[PDB]
Amino acid sequence: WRVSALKEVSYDVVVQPRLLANPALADALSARRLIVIDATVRSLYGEQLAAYLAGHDVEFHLCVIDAHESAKVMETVFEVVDAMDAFGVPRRHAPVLAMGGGVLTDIVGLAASLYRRATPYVRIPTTLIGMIDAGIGAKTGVNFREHKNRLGTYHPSSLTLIDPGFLATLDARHLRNGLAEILKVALVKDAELFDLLEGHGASLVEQRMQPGAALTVLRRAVQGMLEELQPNLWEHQLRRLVDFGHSFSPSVEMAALPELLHGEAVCIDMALSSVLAHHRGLLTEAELGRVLDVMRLLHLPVLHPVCTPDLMRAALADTVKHRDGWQHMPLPRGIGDAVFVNDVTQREIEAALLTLAERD
């Protein structure tokens, strides 16, 4: 026999300022709902969130996770599953709410995907990484031993609600961190987005993306990411523009734990790859100069001591397996476009590391 079936996945990504008075957190839910919330968010937006739901007639239980990258593992997933069991979450008419950064929503997303083999949830990203990348995709997952995101699923939330108001309480470091993922999109897809960052990047960090440039920047980032994910949501096509900055960074992020945030590790990979592109003639000296200056302006690292030739080698090799025996490396071709290569040599990487070393 052949069995063949089609699956329609569709989900919503909606910008909804002032989320916690009338706007639909209330009817994103409906009523009794389980809410899995990042500890620091709980401390910061808990009083307001609970006032919302009680006034809007919704009973709830907060499952609080103190979320960080080291504990982004299966045991934390079991903690969320425990909460679903004790709350009595039903098969599908009562979605679970994940409210936190990209660590939180990746964990709850994977718990929800496993629970009875699929359980609907809603995402409320509270960090910049969450709002323009981690909270709007289909990918979920956790680390397994020294391997980044080794275990996971494709399980988008049926709704993502983005309220840029949450970014107001981030510190400069995490604001910049999320700006790294926006720069990724810009460098290979969107020259105007790159321009907005160069022109406004400092102010956006200083103002924590509070307001109308920040609004434009967030809109294009999301639009950029979604154009890339929507037609390739389960990554049947393994050449992915969005893989830019993610060829070396997984091994680098894991080896430096906990010194580098995800976007910082991503930026090291982007700076390496941009130097690679330059050495190849795909980027001019002037353009390379433009990229590395936005990076220093966003106070983002271009290098780390974890980043030795051997680690860079091992990092690449782990990625070739992930990409099914191909490098499929996106290199920027000018600013706002990219090419996929499969002939990156260890020699080229060492030269590019030295070039970063003199810059840095």
Ligand X SMILES: NC(=O)C1=CN([C@@H]2O[C@H](COP(=O)(O)OP(=O)(O)OC[C@H]3O[C@@H](n4cnc5c(N)ncnc54)[C@H](O)[C@@H]3O)[C@@H](O)[C@H]2O)C=CC1
- Footprint on residues 296-335 left by a copy of itself (CB under 8 A): 321-325
| Nearest residue (CB) to ligand X, 108 versus 352 | 108
Which residues of the shown chain bind ligand X in the complex (CB under 6 A)? 38, 40-41, 44, 67-69, 72, 100-104, 106, 126-127, 129-130, 133-134, 137, 139-140, 149, 166, 169-170, 174, 177, 261-262
**What is d(CA 140, CA 119) in angstroms, rounded to the nearest whole number?**
13
Residue 193 contact among a copy of itself, ligand X, none, beta carbon within 5 to 8 Å by kind: none
Task: Identify the active-site residue in 7, 139, 184, 189.
Answer: 139
| CA 238 vs CA 67, 112, 225, 241: distances in Å | 30, 26, 16, 10
- Tell me: is residue 299 an annotated ligand-binding position: no
**Contact between residue 104 and residue 38 where contact means Cβ atoms under 8 Å apart:** yes
- Tell me: is residue 69 an annotated ligand-binding position: yes
- Tell me: is residue 277 an annotated ligand-binding position: no
* Catalytic residue status for 189: no
**What is d(CA 42, CA 99) in angstroms, rounded to the nearest whole number?**
9
**What is d(CA 120, CA 11) in angstroms, rounded to the nearest whole number?**
11
Residues in contact with a copy of itself, shown as a per-residue x/- string from 130 to 169 under the rule CB under 8 A: ---------x-x--xx-x--xxxxx-x-------------
The only residue of 117, 237, 285, 345 in contact with a copy of itself, by rule CB under 8 A: 117
Structure tokens at 3: 């069995």
| Nearest residue (CB) to a copy of itself, 122 versus 352 | 122
108-128 in b/e burial notation, b at 16+ Cβ within 10 A? bbbbbbbbeeebbbbbbbbbb
**Contact between residue 65 and residue 37 where contact means Cβ atoms under 8 Å apart:** yes
| Nearest residue (CB) to ligand X, 221 versus 344 | 221
Give Cβ neighbours of residue 331 (< 8 Å, ≥ 6 apart). Answer: 273, 276, 277, 280, 282, 338, 339, 340, 341
- Residues found near a copy of itself in the complex (CB under 8 A): 1-14, 74, 78, 81, 85, 88, 90-93, 113-118, 139, 141, 144-145, 147, 150-154, 156, 222-223, 226, 229-231, 233-235, 238, 321-325
Please state the residue numbers annotated as binding site: 38, 69-72, 102-106, 126-127, 139, 148, 166-169, 181, 246, 262
